[PDB]
Design a protein around this motif. Structure first.
Motif, mmCIF file in Angstrom:
data_model
loop_
_atom_site.group_PDB
_atom_site.id
_atom_site.type_symbol
_atom_site.label_atom_id
_atom_site.label_comp_id
_atom_site.label_asym_id
_atom_site.label_seq_id
_atom_site.Cartn_x
_atom_site.Cartn_y
_atom_site.Cartn_z
ATOM 1 N N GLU A 55 22.721 80.993 -45.129
ATOM 2 C CA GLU A 55 23.658 82.049 -45.491
ATOM 3 C C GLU A 55 23.952 81.994 -46.983
ATOM 4 O O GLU A 55 24.159 80.914 -47.543
ATOM 5 N N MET A 100 26.032 82.937 -50.609
ATOM 6 C CA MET A 100 27.409 82.781 -51.053
ATOM 7 C C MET A 100 27.934 84.131 -51.521
ATOM 8 O O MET A 100 27.420 84.701 -52.489
ATOM 9 N N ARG A 152 35.036 83.919 -51.888
ATOM 10 C CA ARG A 152 35.428 82.797 -52.733
ATOM 11 C C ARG A 152 36.640 83.153 -53.583
ATOM 12 O O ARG A 152 37.572 82.349 -53.728
ATOM 13 N N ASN A 179 37.550 66.896 -52.896
ATOM 14 C CA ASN A 179 36.493 67.868 -53.156
ATOM 15 C C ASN A 179 36.957 69.287 -52.859
ATOM 16 O O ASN A 179 36.682 70.216 -53.631
ATOM 17 N N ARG A 229 39.265 70.471 -55.652
ATOM 18 C CA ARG A 229 38.528 70.845 -56.854
ATOM 19 C C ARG A 229 37.841 72.195 -56.682
ATOM 20 O O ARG A 229 37.860 73.036 -57.594
ATOM 21 N N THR A 242 29.856 69.741 -54.588
ATOM 22 C CA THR A 242 30.290 69.751 -55.978
ATOM 23 C C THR A 242 29.635 68.617 -56.756
ATOM 24 O O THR A 242 29.625 67.466 -56.311
ATOM 25 N N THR A 254 21.968 77.796 -53.235
ATOM 26 C CA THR A 254 23.170 78.483 -52.772
ATOM 27 C C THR A 254 24.332 78.282 -53.735
ATOM 28 O O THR A 254 24.976 79.250 -54.154
#
Lengths: 50, 50, 50
Positions: A12, A14, A19, A42, A45, B11, C35
């Motif tokens: 998939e 992005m 987002r 994580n 961030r 990340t 991605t």
């Protein structure tokens, strides 16, 4: 006792808009305060970058 | 192992490369962990059991 | 404009060509996940154009 993390399913793409929206709603929905947390580092961030 | 460590589907983190072109010659993470000790050396056996 | 786009390191398998090409400052030592790769990466020309 339970913390969350972000994932992306294989194959998939992005989408930018989701987002953009998630970076705004995450700061109001979750807690990462000085006494307990709901998120990993994580995830925090990534939400900050969004 | 070098390819696995450098592959980052989450990340990214800071990485510093070393003077030599040998594999696993870099330092990774916010705490710079020296990965040079995992290269094989049959005189002392650093990278494996023993 | 201001980025270093060629580089020299320890010798290549062929001694007559020991150059590494770096468009936009990107290093090719690491594998990439298409991605989510360039989430927070910029270079000088692109930022000036923006």
């Amino acid at each position: 006792q339970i913390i969350l993390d972000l994932k992306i399913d294989p194959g998939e793409r992005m989408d930018p808009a989701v987002r953009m929206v998630a970076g705004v709603v995450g700061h109001l929905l979750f807690t990462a305060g000085g006494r307990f947390t709901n998120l990993t580092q994580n995830m925090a961030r990534q939400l900050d970058i969004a | 192992l070098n390819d696995y460590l450098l592959y980052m589907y989450n990340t990214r983190v800071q990485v510093n490369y070393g003077p030599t072109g040998e594999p696993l010659d870099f330092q990774i993470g916010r705490n710079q962990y020296d990965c040079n000790v995992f290269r094989a050396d049959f005189a002392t056996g650093t990278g494996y059991n023993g | 404009w201001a980025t270093i786009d060629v580089e020299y390191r320890e010798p290549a398998p062929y001694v007559h060509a020991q150059r590494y090409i770096r468009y936009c400052g990107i290093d090719s030592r690491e594998l990439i996940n298409p991605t989510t790769y360039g989430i927070g990466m910029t270079y000088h020309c692109y930022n000036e154009m923006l």
